[PDB]
Amino acid sequence: KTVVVTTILESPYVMMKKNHEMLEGNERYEGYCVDLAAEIAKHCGFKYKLTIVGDGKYGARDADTKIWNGMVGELVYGKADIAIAPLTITLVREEVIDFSKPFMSLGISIMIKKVSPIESAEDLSKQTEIAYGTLDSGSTKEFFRRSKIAVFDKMWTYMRSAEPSVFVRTTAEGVARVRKSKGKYAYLLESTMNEYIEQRKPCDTMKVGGNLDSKGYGIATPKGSSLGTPVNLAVLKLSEQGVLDKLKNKWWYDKGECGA
Amino acid sequence: KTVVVTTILESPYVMMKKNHEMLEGNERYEGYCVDLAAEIAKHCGFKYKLTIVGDGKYGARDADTKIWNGMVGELVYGKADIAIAPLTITLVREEVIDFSKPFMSLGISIMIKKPQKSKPLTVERMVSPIESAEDLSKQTEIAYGTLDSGSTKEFFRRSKIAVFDKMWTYMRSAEPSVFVRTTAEGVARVRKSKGKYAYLLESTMNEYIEQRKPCDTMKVGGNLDSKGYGIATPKGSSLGTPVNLAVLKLSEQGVLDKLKNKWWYDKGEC
Amino acid sequence: KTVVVTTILESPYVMMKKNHEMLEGNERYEGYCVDLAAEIAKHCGFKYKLTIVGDGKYGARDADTKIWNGMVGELVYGKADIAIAPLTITLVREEVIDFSKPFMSLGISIMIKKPQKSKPLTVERMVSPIESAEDLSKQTEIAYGTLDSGSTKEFFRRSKIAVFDKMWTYMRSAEPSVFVRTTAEGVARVRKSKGKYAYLLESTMNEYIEQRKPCDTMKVGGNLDSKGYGIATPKGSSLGTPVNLAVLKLSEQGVLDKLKNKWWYDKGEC
Amino acid sequence: KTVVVTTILESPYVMMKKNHEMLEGNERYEGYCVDLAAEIAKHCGFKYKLTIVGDGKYGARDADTKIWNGMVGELVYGKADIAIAPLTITLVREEVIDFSKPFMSLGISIMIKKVSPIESAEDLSKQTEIAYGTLDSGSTKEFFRRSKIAVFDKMWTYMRSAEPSVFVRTTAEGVARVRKSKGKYAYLLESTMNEYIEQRKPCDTMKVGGNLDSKGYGIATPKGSSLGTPVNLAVLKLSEQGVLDKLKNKWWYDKGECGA
Ligand SMILES: NS(=O)(=O)c1cc2c(cc1Cl)N[C@H]([C@H]1C[C@H]3C=C[C@@H]1C3)NS2(=O)=O
Ligand SMILES: NS(=O)(=O)c1cc2c(cc1Cl)N[C@H]([C@H]1C[C@H]3C=C[C@@H]1C3)NS2(=O)=O
Ligand SMILES: NS(=O)(=O)c1cc2c(cc1Cl)N[C@H]([C@H]1C[C@H]3C=C[C@@H]1C3)NS2(=O)=O
Ligand SMILES: NS(=O)(=O)c1cc2c(cc1Cl)N[C@H]([C@H]1C[C@H]3C=C[C@@H]1C3)NS2(=O)=O
Ligand SMILES: N[C@@H](CCC(=O)O)C(=O)O
Ligand SMILES: N[C@@H](CCC(=O)O)C(=O)O
Ligand SMILES: N[C@@H](CCC(=O)O)C(=O)O
Ligand SMILES: N[C@@H](CCC(=O)O)C(=O)O
Numbered sequence A, D: 001k002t003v004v005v006t007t008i009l010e011s012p013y014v015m016m017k018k019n020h021e022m023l024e025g026n027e028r029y030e031g032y033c034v035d036l037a038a039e040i041a042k043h044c045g046f047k048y049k050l051t052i053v054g055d056g057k058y059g060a061r062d063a064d065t066k067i068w069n070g071m072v073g074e075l076v077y078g079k080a081d082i083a084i085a086p087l088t089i090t091l092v093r094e095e096v097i098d099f100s101k102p103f104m105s106l107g108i109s110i111m112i113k114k115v116s117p118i119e120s121a122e123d124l125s126k127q128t129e130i131a132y133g134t135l136d137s138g139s140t141k142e143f144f145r146r147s148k149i150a151v152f153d154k155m156w157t158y159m160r161s162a163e164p165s166v167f168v169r170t171t172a173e174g175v176a177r178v179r180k181s182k183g184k185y186a187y188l189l190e191s192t193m194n195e196y197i198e199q200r201k202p203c204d205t206m207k208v209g210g211n212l213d214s215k216g217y218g219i220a221t222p223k224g225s226s227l228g229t230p231v232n233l234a235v236l237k238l239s240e241q242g243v244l245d246k247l248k249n250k251w252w253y254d255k256g257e258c259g260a
Numbered sequence B, C: 001k002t003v004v005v006t007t008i009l010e011s012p013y014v015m016m017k018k019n020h021e022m023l024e025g026n027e028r029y030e031g032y033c034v035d036l037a038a039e040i041a042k043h044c045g046f047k048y049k050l051t052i053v054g055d056g057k058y059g060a061r062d063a064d065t066k067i068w069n070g071m072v073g074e075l076v077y078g079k080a081d082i083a084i085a086p087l088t089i090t091l092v093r094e095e096v097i098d099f100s101k102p103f104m105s106l107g108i109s110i111m112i113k114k115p116q117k118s119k120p121l122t123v124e125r126m127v128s129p130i131e132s133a134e135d136l137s138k139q140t141e142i143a144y145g146t147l148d149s150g151s152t153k154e155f156f157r158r159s160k161i162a163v164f165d166k167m168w169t170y171m172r173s174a175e176p177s178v179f180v181r182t183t184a185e186g187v188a189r190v191r192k193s194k195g196k197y198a199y200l201l202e203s204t205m206n207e208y209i210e211q212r213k214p215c216d217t218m219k220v221g222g223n224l225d226s227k228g229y230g231i232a233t234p235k236g237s238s239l240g241t242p243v244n245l246a247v248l249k250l251s252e253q254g255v256l257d258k259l260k261n262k263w264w265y266d267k268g269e270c
Helices: A032-044 A070-076 A121-126 A140-146 A150-160 A171-180 A191-198 A228-241 A243-252 B032-043 B070-076 B133-138 B151-158 B162-172 B183-192 B203-210 B240-252 B256-265 C032-043 C070-076 C133-138 C151-157 C162-172 C183-192 C203-210 C240-253 C255-264 D032-044 D070-076 D121-126 D140-145 D150-160 D171-180 D191-198 D228-240 D243-252
Strands: A003-007 A048-052 A097-099 A104-106 A108-113 A131-133 A185-190 A205-208 A215-217 A220-222 B003-007 B048-052 B097-099 B104-106 B108-113 B143-145 B197-202 B217-220 B227-229 B232-234 C003-007 C048-052 C083-088 C097-099 C108-113 C143-146 C197-202 C217-220 C227-234 D003-007 D048-052 D097-099 D104-106 D108-113 D131-133 D185-190 D205-208 D215-217 D220-222
Touching: A003 A032, A003 A070, A032 A048, A032 A228, A032 A243, A070 A097, A070 A220, A104 A191, A108 A171, A108 A191, A121 A150, A131 A150, A140 A150, A140 A185, A171 A185, A171 A205, A185 A191, A191 A205, A191 A243, A228 A243, B003 B032, B003 B070, B032 B048, B032 B240, B032 B256, B070 B097, B070 B232, B104 B203, B108 B183, B108 B203, B133 B162, B143 B162, B151 B162, B151 B197, B183 B197, B183 B217, B197 B203, B203 B217, B203 B256, C003 C032, C003 C070, C032 C048, C032 C083, C032 C240, C032 C255, C070 C083, C070 C097, C070 C227, C108 C183, C108 C203, C133 C162, C143 C151, C143 C162, C151 C162, C151 C197, C183 C197, C183 C217, C197 C203, C203 C217, C203 C255, C227 C240, C240 C255, D003 D032, D003 D070, D032 D048, D032 D228, D032 D243, D070 D097, D070 D220, D104 D191, D108 D171, D108 D191, D121 D150, D131 D150, D140 D150, D140 D185, D171 D185, D171 D205, D185 D191, D191 D205, D191 D243, D228 D243
Parallel strands: A003 A048, A131 A185, B003 B048, B143 B197, C003 C048, C003 C083, C143 C197, D003 D048, D131 D185
Antiparallel strands: A097 A220, A104 A215, A108 A185, A108 A205, B097 B232, B104 B227, B108 B197, B108 B217, C083 C227, C097 C227, C108 C197, C108 C217, D097 D220, D104 D215, D108 D185, D108 D205
């Protein structure tokens, strides 16, 4: 039985190679998550077919409709059998799907244009001159929405009541906006994506401050699925063997198309 | 029905109170683990009694006897209900118990006695003799060791990486034995060896010892791997899901980092 | 029975919301005073509705009529039950209303236009034509004035000190009048006078305005006196004791300090 | 009817006269509080005699016996008609006696012997090397005991479980201990007393950091007494007339037996 794998077009996790027009099957995709899915399939022993989610949504709940979208919705409603993708392990997602152990640690950080005047998040929140947003239908926005800390609550009040719209449909759109806003815009995104962007050409974006929190990416399965324990054990074995560290080093720092 | 909470005696996770002789119950202990357990019980309401394992061992399945020992050993045999302790998630451990999501990150690091500042315009510079695991595994003047019956020993035993393979090859055959039973024993060995012994311990305990007096140690190099501590639970238990949800709630509520800052960086003597 | 709370329209005690055209009730205002009202209503259970006085004046007595106006005026004649507003405690108001213990300290200070950077090794220094109330009293190039129907005006009127007597003597018969109808109008006059006019206002408002953009002002010298802000209440009312105990509770708990820090130093710039 | 006035031997509030052995009546006492009592009695129009409380204690609740001591207990039990003294206005005291409007501003400050490694109270609480204590049966002790902030809770747990005893019987004993402990001790006391001590010979003590909180001194009076409103009005009149400022300048800065 072929296992349908859902995933998102995110770099360096999934990319459509360079000549994908002449390739078919799983051979037209590449990245960290493709290699991770290959290793998971090798360990468990099943045939898999990578599928990109129809809408570039990670997963959230809509406006009082109680319907899941994105990869989480693709998993809950029986469309996909597993989700190997940069899916953050969160409170609301775990109650509806099973998350394996985190295969990559991360945190929420700030990226700006290339001694920064803001650095820490308190200084950026206090200074209302420079705008900042997040990725819609993601986990950073839901982290700010449900946070009870004063600084994060103030930041959420700022971003919610912002004119014009400060949210970005895609993280690539957020990166382009940061590059094109001449330093008047800041981006709140995951640390791994921030490092990958800042270490890539044209290398004009830099990451300031520390990490607001600490989270992780997990391999998700539908609630009550038979693949949960096998993929959890596969992730543990891969972490012990160092395959995850090798994959991160290959896909994050091996090329390094900038001077640093 | 009141369930028991087994734990190891390790700082700053669990520490004895200064006047703990006359207190009784959960009040005799203090640290990150005790109020972690308090907040876990607050999230899902239940009565807990703190206990310390008799052998004082983290847990590692033996050889040729096929018997689990330590916290894991007494957890699989139904003498403990939940282990809110710095137990490291490990593949062989996961096959016999259940772990929650990691509540604090960690890594294997190197602790050596802090060298004295070099005299040589008048800027003082700190130079250590070991700066990475590869040069530690290449030399022989400095000996290194791990904690007996722990996750680090098992990690070094089964590692196929060349540097770690050489590390374990030297560790297994070395007189006197380079292994210690208590983390405090290893720290004392580092502090008394006069910069000729290196301790391979967890990064969290390493940094905690760095932050406290007499601060005669330094952490060299980066973490050798990435792992995490998980709250243990035996298979076929109804407490696994509530515990996991409680850990997720505490992580998303900004409580785990607050406790980490309170117990690690606030009381920084050095 | 729901009592009414009347407040003055000044920042940062009570400020209009940005998109305030759509919300109704107590959600149309924000600031230190609305938080104080919320905590007062939390310490003792009662429903409150915020109101703004029609005249917009703090309160005093009118000449040759002996009729109170302002917040005190609408408090004495039964049109209000409590005034959680920056109302200065004076002797002429204590004989007609009740005042709780002060919840914030204040003092009459001097606000002038901030001078420029003195170019003359290469170090910038701040020099102002006015450094204290005495030299402001002798000099006549710079005019000065106080808010009309306030507490500072009544303090300067009823003063026997020679410097303050001279201050009042100049203020009374100036051409044109040096008094202003609103603190915002006085600050606008200071900003538009090109440094030839100085405003005598409370230290709290002066500091808050100095901390906020465009921050073209600064406070010179020290406070001319020590005074406090009280929560007013009509004479013979069954709310003075609970309000006073609530203020004491908030001061002991540190709520007043955190509210001051949040509304004065967590929103400033330059 | 002669009004009995209770007070405490505190400098510069009440001092015993340099030639007091040859004087009788109220003429054998001097200080800020003596002049304040004289002005209060002049405004109100009554004959008063100054009485020093039989124990040099301000007032507190003892161990579960529910009995007030010091000046507060000298007022509640119908032995003193008014208390003009450096009595802090507090939550517990107000429920039992009436406090007039404050006539002095103050706060809890730290006094040490003359790089200043201590700085604010955070670094003093985080460093257990140097001991710190307060005055027993006062307001600082009851401020730390009932505090709910982490720093103040930690400080109170430190002082309570400290061997040997760290609380001083009298504030003068605290100053002597600070001067003699070779700077291994830190005194927590009101800012007014701290300034007066640091501005007097031998001028070997100094005050660091700011004030943790803001409080005030108030003229107390038995609950349900006719003197409350007249003394409140008198304090307000003296504050508007600038007599309290003049008295503070006379008794705090007029002499200044130190070079600063
Ligand atoms: N260095 S890294 O970010 O690629 C990374 C991060 C992590 C890894 C493995 C790697 Cl390689 N494994 C851990 C998992 C493994 C076992 C121990 C903790 C969890 C369960 N999660 S992690 O701490 O998020
Ligand atoms: N900063 S820290 O080491 O105290 C720390 C470390 C971690 C935290 C929370 C904190 Cl505060 N939560 C994560 C958990 C949250 C969700 C995502 C990964 C696991 C499930 N594990 S973690 O990456 O091991
Ligand atoms: N630091 S501040 O100006 O916000 C401030 C000022 C004051 C506070 C509390 C604070 Cl936080 N409480 C005091 C009150 C408490 C008790 C002692 C004096 C009055 C009754 N009044 S105060 O001296 O006017
Ligand atoms: N400068 S000082 O400390 O001697 C000082 C301090 C204060 C004074 C008067 C003086 Cl002189 N009066 C005020 C009182 C007067 C009226 C206004 C606030 C209270 C009621 N309390 S105070 O703000 O605590
Ligand atoms: N990786 C995040 C989305 C990215 C973001 O929100 O910044 C998730 O899976 O929820
Ligand atoms: N935390 C480790 C023990 C510490 C060590 O082995 O260094 C474990 O749970 O196994
Ligand atoms: N706070 C003053 C008004 C401000 C002023 O007069 O400057 C009062 O309540 O009367
Ligand atoms: N002045 C304080 C006592 C001094 C102290 O506690 O430091 C009071 O009257 O309560």
